[PDB]
Design a protein around this ligand. Sequence first.
Ligand code: Y27
Lengths: 341, 20
Amino acid sequence: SEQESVKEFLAKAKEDFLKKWENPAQNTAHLDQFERIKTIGTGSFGRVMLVKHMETGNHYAMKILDKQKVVKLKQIEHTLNEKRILQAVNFPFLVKLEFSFKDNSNLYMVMEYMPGGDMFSHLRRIGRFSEPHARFYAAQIVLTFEYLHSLDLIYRDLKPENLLIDQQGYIKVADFGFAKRVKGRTWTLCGTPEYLAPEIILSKGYNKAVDWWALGVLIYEMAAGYPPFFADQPIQIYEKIVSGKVRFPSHFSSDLKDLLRNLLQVDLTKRFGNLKNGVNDIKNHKWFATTDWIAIYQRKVEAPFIPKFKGPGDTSNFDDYEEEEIRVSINEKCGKEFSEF
Amino acid sequence: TTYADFIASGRTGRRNAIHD
Ligand SMILES: C[C@@H](N)[C@H]1CC[C@H](C(=O)Nc2ccncc2)CC1
């Protein structure tokens, strides 16, 4: 069976993950091994910089978290989740963590650098993706969620902003700031407004089904050019999501609509991904009938879009940000809170 | 159109995550 080769794949993958989960990599480099080049991302949850490792010459993306800002934002345990999970995982469509370390002031996570930029920037520019184009990316997500959920991981922030395009035109999921290893239900309110399942909004206690709901949002946005539930302010977006009504553009194929009605399904006993058949309800769906799941895993499918290669440290696919100092205090901040990082 | 309403809205740039 294809379901049995697959079960075998996941068994090996889990034994691999647990070994790193139970004994995490720690303190594997130092800031002064990296030359800083450019801020390619900034936000509430730290910034991301292009750097260059001197000993190898390799370019990398370095996420910096101010430990004091993390404590004030009450993201201590999420930050610890993020690093422990990213260091343990291993899958083609997950951005790979090369190093992590910390100093008196900061936490650092050095990832492989994707010069091609995020899906977001290309989706906005082009307007929308063709169904075949959107399906190609959706398949990568479907498989990644298959892998994550098999490890008891929920991702909780699927959106085009968190998806990077590599040099073969395949995607990498980045930012694990709200990922959590949980076997039961959980209750934290987190995610991005447009992508939130109704059960998060209504404060109910949820599981990995929220990840499949967010898949439906993503595929919709990719093929429509805009998301299924938008407005100018979050509370208005929440009223739309909980209403149970969604409108599709007249260009959506009738298979795409039917897939999306089962992903953006309020009723958890009916939502694709959450039922007795699990991820095969998605994988065997007619919209995906031309998808060869193994060749997508193997990166043998021809990509609809390969971004323009401008050098290994080129930054033209990212916007410009105001550059700040990386200041390292002479006193240790929050030693105890982050000891396991 | 729906696309035109989207493109005139304030939420066409990169969206931030929320938290309680
Ligand atoms: C919007 C946020 N949730 C977050 C999305 C991912 C981004 C990043 O890691 N970019 C990146 C990583 C590796 N290589 C190139 C870019 C940082 C900002």
